[PDB]
Design a binder for this molecule. Structure first.
Ligand SMILES: CCCCCCCCO[C@@H]1O[C@H](CO)[C@@H](O)[C@H](O)[C@H]1O
Ligand SMILES: CC(C)C[C@H](N)C(=O)O
Ligand code: NA
Ligand code: NA
Length: 488
């Protein structure tokens, strides 16, 4: 079995797993949507009660299954629960990361295409708010092909489609080289490049000042202290830490049987929170508060993540010295943040085809890329198909799967056996208070917030096109698990 080469590469790959498009596009919107500092109190509590303990649990289940040559949840769930229903529930560990990748890599291709056009300077040129925002709103709308009539049909540009082929190629070139020579070798290069670009953008944004305000006013808003906020904070913690995607589990399956996971997992989770709360929150919102004030920035944040990251922020930079190049640094930061994460949610399908169907790494990567590339045409051409996948897999699915794997590992497999499996080989030991959080508090926290979510919030016909296709993806993945059974 493939293994991580160095301790540093494991941390950076796991950090690159978590540090992604959410740190810079999704977290600023959710924090500003829910009161800035008001959102942080549930966000911090969710990180301590859900994010941290589920980090250690997924590290344990991955290393446990990896020791037996099984990197994905269809087999690992069966190793922790000798039931055929554990294999069925494990399919979500293949379905969730595959569905999320189907729209994630496409949005990642947006950042690459924008970074290219912003580097060559093929960007809209506004003259001396709507008069400068419209050239950038139309720039994104022409790139992805926003519908102009009633038909919910996206018409991507030839450039956007070609950049998506390039983006898939860059993902394949990294994945096909393996864990150590591919994912780990790229993490040692991409994470320092990511941190430097983010710190520079934070510094440059902190120098923004207009009559409407300063960047410090946005920092004061996001740090000054409703069930919907608690749902938003816990959901954000899942997505930003890559929990519930089966991605941490597959990566951890290449950690050696006796290596530390307690300190290593805690460091990667901490690195992500630093990148998100310190670096990510200090760019988008402060630059918007500087140019529009706090009240308008909360209004701009409610307009969406794509609006702030692809329209508003490049339009703000277009008013500063060298802002076109600053937009390139911004979009290149997003591309490396997405690239280190998209390879992480495609590796589970790779590891499954390798471990359970005995496919060569080359074959597993190419077929996984074929499935993602083909399925992504739904996200590229059907309007709001992206939103439907992000809801079922990236929103509902991850919280459902997070509670599922905890019950399997810490209840069905045994609370004492799981706790001993987590701390085994750890440089440090998990604080004994977290044993009771894992066994009682975390599943109670998830079950309560998940019931309010289902009972109070979940209740166009084209959404069935996406539901029909991703339900078929689950059936197809179930059939592959069945074929893996028949071989044994
Ligand atoms: C199931 C998929 C069958 C149809 C595959 C079509 C592949 C996409 O085709 C391409 O899409 C781009 C987006 O507008 C266009 O700019 C290109 O002109 C077109 O060649
Ligand atoms: C789906 C995950 C890889 C997302 C990633 N953790 C992010 O923050 O963008
Ligand atoms: Na993140
Ligand atoms: Na990443």
């Amino acid at each position: 079995r493939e293994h991580w080469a160095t301790r540093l590469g494991l941390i950076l790959a796991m950090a690159g797993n978590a540090v992604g498009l959410c740190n810079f596009l999704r977290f600023p919107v959710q924090a500003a949507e829910n009161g800035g500092g008001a959102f942080m109190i549930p966000y911090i509590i969710a990180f301590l009660l859900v994010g941290i303990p589920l980090m250690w649990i997924e590290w344990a289940m991955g290393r446990y299954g990896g020791a037996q040559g099984h990197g994905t949840t269809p087999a690992i769930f069966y190793l922790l629960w000798r039931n055929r229903f554990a294999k069925i529930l494990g399919v979500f560990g293949l379905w969730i990361p595959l569905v999320v990748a189907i729209y994630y890599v496409y949005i990642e291709s947006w950042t690459l295409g924008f970074a290219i056009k912003f580097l060559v300077g093929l960007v809209p040129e506004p003259p001396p708010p709507d008069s400068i925002l419209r050239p950038f709103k139309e720039f994104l709308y022409s790139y992805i092909g926003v519908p102009k009539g009633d038909e919910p049909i996206l018409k991507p540009s030839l450039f956007a489609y070609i950049v998506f082929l390039i983006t898939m190629f860059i993902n394949v070139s990294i994945l096909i080289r393996g864990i150590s020579k591919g994912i780990e070798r790229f993490a040692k290069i991409a994470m320092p490049t990511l941190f430097i670009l983010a710190v520079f953008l934070v510094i440059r944004v902190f120098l923004l000042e207009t009559p409407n305000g300063t960047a410090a006013d946005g920092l004061n808003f996001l740090w000054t202290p409703d069930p919907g906020v608690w749902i938003a904070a816990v959901g954000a913690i899942f997505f930003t830490l890559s929990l519930g995607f089966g991605a941490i589990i597959t990566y951890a399956s290449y950690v050696r049987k006796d290596q530390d996971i307690v300190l290593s997992g805690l460091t990667a989770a901490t690195l992500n929170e630093k990148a998100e709360v310190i670096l990510g929150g200090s760019i988008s919102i402060p630059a918007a508060v500087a140019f529009f004030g706090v009240a308008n920035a909360v209004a701009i944040a409610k307009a969406g993540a794509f609006n702030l990251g692809f329209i508003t922020l490049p339009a703000i930079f277009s008013q500063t010295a060298g802002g076109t190049f600053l937009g390139f640094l911004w979009f290149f930061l997003l591309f490396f943040a997405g690239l280190t994460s998209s390879i992480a949610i495609m590796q589970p399908m790779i590891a499954f085809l390798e471990d359970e169907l005995k496919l060569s790494r080359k074959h597993a990567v190419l077929w996984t890329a074929a499935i993602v590339f083909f399925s992504a045409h739904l996200v590229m051409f059907l309007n709001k198909s992206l939103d439907e996948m992000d809801f079922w897999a990236g929103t509902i699915g991850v919280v459902f799967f997070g509670l599922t794997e905890l019950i399997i590992f810490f209840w069905i497999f045994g609370a004492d056996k799981a706790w001993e499996e987590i701390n085994r080989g750890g440089i440090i030991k998990v604080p004994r208070i977290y044993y009771y959080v894992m066994r009682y508090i975390t599943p109670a926290f998830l079950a309560v917030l998940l019931v309010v979510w289902a009972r109070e919030y979940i209740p166009h016909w084209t959404v069935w096109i996406t539901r029909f296709y991703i339900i078929g993806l689950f059936l197809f993945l179930t059939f592959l698990v069945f074929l893996a059974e028949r071989r044994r």
